[PDB]
Amino acid sequence: GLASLADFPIGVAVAASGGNADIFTSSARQNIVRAEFNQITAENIMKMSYMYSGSNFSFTNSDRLVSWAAQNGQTVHGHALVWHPSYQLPNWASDSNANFRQDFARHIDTVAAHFAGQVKSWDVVNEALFDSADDPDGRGSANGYRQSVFYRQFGGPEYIDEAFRRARAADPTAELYYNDFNTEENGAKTTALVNLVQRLLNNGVPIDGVGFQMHVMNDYPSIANIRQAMQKIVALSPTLKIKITELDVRLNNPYDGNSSNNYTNRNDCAVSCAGLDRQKARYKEIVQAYLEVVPPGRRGGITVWGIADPDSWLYTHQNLPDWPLLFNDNLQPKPAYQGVVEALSG
Ligand SMILES: [Ca+2]
């Protein structure tokens, strides 16, 4: 399968929260993972609050998934030690908590140590950069940083430095990533990423790599911009790894000012459409760009954000249907899959 075609991880995000996508109950999905991939990311169940049951640590469900991975030919990318969304904040992660910095330290120390030897790499900090598209409380930018509870408590970006230092100390063997989205656009957020990463390097922080989520559309951003954004980050260091962490590809572009090039019906791309053929070329060109600009020995992996289209968080988005992944609703490989094959094989 796909993983055989590369010497770096070829991964997939897996569900484990019930319903049709749940990896524990879907033999068809288990079989695809074993055949095609050699790494998993937990789509949800390694987020911060999932490390607790009541006020105590609880690793039962995440341990089950990590063990399944080890039994089925998969390494694990941990997602994520620090992330801002309120739905997954531990209850300690509050401006009302006087003990915040101590509880933060305990979180990273405990979780990273717990998974030592079982989890190859981590998203240590995820989504620390400001994004207007993603500022529902209207807090605004602090010179490009998101003013999450971590930022507010620490009075600035030092929480990022600390998270990386503690993760390194707790599990020296793990590859430590900074992960974010829209950083492939080669715009304002890419520049903020350069600032963020350069500051960490200047501070001697043990960051091993940068993750690009790569939640893209078929025709935006341009491949030239994606390529240059990755190049900018590769240029910051002789050793920093690059990982594509959450790749998926929307046929529909809501935001292009054209409502006549939208597929509005689920049947539009059920069998064949221009969009599935472009999606093949899109997966192909992105994987090719990764290979071209990320040196051998600095390739941390390529992961797609789910197995089959109906599992995707973008199966519906903006009240429109989409088909973002490598396998369709009947779990058959799509042209997208072949695009990855062709890129990885040269
Ligand atoms: Ca459109």
UniProtKB/Swiss-Prot annotation:
It is an enzyme of class 3 (hydrolase). It catalyses: Endohydrolysis of (1->4)-beta-D-xylosidic linkages in xylans. The active site is at E127, E246. One of its GO terms (molecular function) is endo-1,4-beta-xylanase activity. Its EC number is 3.2.1.8. GO terms for biological process: xylan catabolic process. Pathway: Glycan degradation; xylan degradation. Transmembrane segments: none annotated. Residues 17-343 form the GH10 domain. Keywords: Carbohydrate metabolism, Disulfide bond, Glycosidase, Hydrolase, Polysaccharide degradation, Signal, Xylan degradation. Belongs to the glycosyl hydrolase 10 (cellulase F) family. This is Endo-1,4-beta-xylanase A. It comes from Cellvibrio japonicus (strain Ueda107) (Pseudomonas fluorescens subsp. cellulosa). The lineage of its organism: Bacteria, Pseudomonadati, Pseudomonadota, Gammaproteobacteria, Cellvibrionales. The chain holds residues 265 to 610 of 611 of the full protein.
